[PDB]
PDB file of C-alpha atoms in Angstrom:
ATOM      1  CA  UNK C  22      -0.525  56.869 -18.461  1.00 49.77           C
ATOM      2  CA  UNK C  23      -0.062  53.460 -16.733  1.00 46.79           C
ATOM      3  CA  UNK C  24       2.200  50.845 -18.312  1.00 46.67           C
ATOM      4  CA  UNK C  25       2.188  47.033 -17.703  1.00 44.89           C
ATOM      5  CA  UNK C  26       5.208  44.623 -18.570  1.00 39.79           C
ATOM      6  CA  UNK C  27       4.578  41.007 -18.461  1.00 39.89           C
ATOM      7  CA  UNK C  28       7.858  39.740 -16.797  1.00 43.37           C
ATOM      8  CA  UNK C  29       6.848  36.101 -16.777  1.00 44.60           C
ATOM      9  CA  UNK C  30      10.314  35.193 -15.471  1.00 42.51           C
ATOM     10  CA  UNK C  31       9.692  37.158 -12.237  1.00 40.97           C
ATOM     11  CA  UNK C  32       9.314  34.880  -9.386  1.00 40.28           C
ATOM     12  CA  UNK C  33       8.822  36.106  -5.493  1.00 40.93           C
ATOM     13  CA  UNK C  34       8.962  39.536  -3.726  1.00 39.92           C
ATOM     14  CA  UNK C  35      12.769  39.135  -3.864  1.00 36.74           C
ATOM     15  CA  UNK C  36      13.230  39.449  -7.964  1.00 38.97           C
ATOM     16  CA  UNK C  37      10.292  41.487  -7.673  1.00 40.08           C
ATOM     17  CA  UNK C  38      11.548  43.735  -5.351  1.00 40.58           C
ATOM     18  CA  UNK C  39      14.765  44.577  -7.389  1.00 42.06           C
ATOM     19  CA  UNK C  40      12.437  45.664 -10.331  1.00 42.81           C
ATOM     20  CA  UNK C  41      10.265  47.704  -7.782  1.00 41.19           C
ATOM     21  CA  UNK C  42      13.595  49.723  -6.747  1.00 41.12           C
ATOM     22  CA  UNK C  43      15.423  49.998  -9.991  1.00 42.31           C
ATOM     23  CA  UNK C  44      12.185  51.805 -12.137  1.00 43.76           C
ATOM     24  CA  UNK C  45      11.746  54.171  -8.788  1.00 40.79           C
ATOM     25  CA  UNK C  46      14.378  55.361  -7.898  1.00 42.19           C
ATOM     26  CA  UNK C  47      15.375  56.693 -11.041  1.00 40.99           C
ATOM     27  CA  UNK C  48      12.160  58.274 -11.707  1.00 40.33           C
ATOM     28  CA  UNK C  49      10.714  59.606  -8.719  1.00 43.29           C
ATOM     29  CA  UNK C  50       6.779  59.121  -9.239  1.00 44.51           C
ATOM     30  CA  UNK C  51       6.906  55.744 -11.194  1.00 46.75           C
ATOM     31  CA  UNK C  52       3.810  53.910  -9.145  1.00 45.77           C
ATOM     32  CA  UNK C  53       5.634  50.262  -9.255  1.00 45.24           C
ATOM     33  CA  UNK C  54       3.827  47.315  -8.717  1.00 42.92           C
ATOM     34  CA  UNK C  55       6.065  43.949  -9.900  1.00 42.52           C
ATOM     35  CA  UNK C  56       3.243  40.825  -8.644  1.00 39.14           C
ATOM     36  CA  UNK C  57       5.094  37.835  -8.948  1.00 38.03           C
ATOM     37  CA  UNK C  58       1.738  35.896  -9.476  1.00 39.22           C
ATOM     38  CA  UNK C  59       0.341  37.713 -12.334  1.00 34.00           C
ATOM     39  CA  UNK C  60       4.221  38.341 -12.881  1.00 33.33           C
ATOM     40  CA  UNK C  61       3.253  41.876 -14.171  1.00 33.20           C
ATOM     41  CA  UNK C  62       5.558  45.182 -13.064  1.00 33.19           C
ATOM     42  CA  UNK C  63       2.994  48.704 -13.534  1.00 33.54           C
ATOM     43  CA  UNK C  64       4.145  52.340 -13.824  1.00 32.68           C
ATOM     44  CA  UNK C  65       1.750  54.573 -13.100  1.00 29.82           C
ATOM     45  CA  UNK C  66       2.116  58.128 -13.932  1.00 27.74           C
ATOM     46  CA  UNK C  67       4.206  57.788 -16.426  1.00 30.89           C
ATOM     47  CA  UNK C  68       3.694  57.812 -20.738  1.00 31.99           C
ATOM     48  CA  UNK C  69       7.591  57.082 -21.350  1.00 30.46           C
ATOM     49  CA  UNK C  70       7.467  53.121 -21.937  1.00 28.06           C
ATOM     50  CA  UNK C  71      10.773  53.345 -23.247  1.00 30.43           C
ATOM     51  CA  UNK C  72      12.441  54.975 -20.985  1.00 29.10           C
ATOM     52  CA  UNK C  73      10.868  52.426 -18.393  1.00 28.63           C
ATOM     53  CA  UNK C  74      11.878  49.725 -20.269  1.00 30.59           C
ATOM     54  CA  UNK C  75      15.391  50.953 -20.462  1.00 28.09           C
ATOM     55  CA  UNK C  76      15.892  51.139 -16.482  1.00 28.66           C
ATOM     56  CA  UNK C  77      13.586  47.359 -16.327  1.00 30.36           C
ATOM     57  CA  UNK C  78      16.562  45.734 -18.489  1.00 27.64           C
ATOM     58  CA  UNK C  79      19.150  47.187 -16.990  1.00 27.47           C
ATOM     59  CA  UNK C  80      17.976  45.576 -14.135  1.00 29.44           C
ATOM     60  CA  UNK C  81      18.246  41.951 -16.171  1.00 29.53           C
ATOM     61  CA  UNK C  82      14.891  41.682 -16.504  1.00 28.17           C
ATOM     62  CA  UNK C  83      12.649  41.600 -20.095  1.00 26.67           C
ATOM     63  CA  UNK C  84      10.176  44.390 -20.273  1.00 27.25           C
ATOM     64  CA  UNK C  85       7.445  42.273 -22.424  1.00 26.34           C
TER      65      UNK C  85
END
């Protein structure tokens, strides 16, 4: 599968970019894509939205 969490708080490449390195490098084939203008973080390759959303938070972030 391919999840999609709104993060509407996400703003720039730099809070992005956090979000982007905290989902893959704790699951090695999460395809992350955190757009700050459609403020939307993808995971492709991955069914586990829950365990997603547990690395996504611990980052600070909401995974909507």
């Amino acid at each position: 599968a391919g999840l999609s969490f709104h993060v509407e708080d996400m703003t720039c490449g730099h809070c992005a970019g956090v979000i982007k390195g905290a989902i893959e490098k704790t699951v090695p084939g999460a395809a992350v894509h955190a757009d700050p203008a459609s403020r939307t973080v993808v995971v492709g390759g991955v069914s586990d939205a829950a365990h997603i959303a547990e690395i996504i938070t611990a980052a600070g972030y909401t995974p909507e």
